[PDB]
Design a protein around this ligand. Structure first.
Ligand SMILES: [Cu+2]
Ligand SMILES: [Cu+2]
Ligand SMILES: [Zn+2]
Ligand SMILES: [Zn+2]
Lengths: 153, 153
């Protein structure tokens, strides 16, 4: 039909945001919203496996990866389902999120409902880095803020 | 086979806590955990429709009610799917949560994954209060804490 989701991001520092998700039937998922309190530049942005905030962002576990692939950018065939690339903040610390993705979903096997959205300290190298870390996390560094993706009206 | 979920309760007051959920296939959902910071006595405990924390606990919307029934206690035939009745806090303000429910699920149309768990200021009257409000909320009153229900390991 039309599915909607929302995620409120919070962490140990000043990073916070609200992210919206809409999927018309089997179409792409449109991701939108704003994140504040970021350092100027690119920040890694992924859906992680577990909607578990019991030990902050660390209990979210790894990138959502039901097809057991290596980390990539959203545009790569080799990617985690959860790989949404980078969001960009300017001098004011504000990122405007605008992403269309056909691998994440708001129902079925690839559903991100009840999973965690995380925004990272550093840029996601999109799996192009020459180490194991790139093939797992895109060398995106620490988890600044996260939240559980919920069903929205 | 065995599905697990977890919920971290937060609000504006001192009311915190972690609720765990386990379901084996199409069996009962077992709810367990502790809630701290509560006033002595019974507090309404429900699953609300929306995993939306944009306006704190109030964006969760009403009781998860896919069968379009009136409010009730968990033991009642005429109830909301979300209606998990009352938790009990001692002198110390700690409620030990232990519930077995047959209407909630962690998959399918009755799934609470991506929905919001809410603990209330007042006792839930199980839809017996004889005002219309009883048939909606059991006059459980305001929402002290909530969290989005997430997929756990
Ligand atoms: Cu991540
Ligand atoms: Cu409630
Ligand atoms: Zn990844
Ligand atoms: Zn109800």
């Amino acid at each position: 039909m039309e599915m909607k989701a929302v995620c409120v991001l919070k962490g140990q520092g000043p990073v916070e945001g609200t992210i919206h998700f809409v999927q018309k039937g089997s179409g792409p998922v449109v991701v939108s919203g704003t994140i504040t309190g970021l350092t100027k530049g690119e920040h890694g942005f992924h859906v992680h496996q577990f909607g578990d905030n019991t030990q902050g962002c660390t209990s979210a576990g790894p990138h959502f990866n039901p097809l057991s692939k290596k980390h990539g950018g959203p545009k790569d065939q080799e990617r985690h389902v959860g790989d949404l690339g980078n969001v960009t903040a300017g001098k004011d610390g504000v990122a405007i999120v605008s992403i269309e993705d056909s691998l994440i979903a708001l129902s079925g096997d690839y559903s991100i409902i009840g999973r965690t959205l995380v925004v990272h300290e550093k840029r996601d190298d999109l799996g192009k880095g020459d180490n194991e870390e790139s093939t797992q996390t895109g060398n995106a560094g620490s988890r600044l803020a996260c939240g559980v993706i919920g069903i929205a009206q």
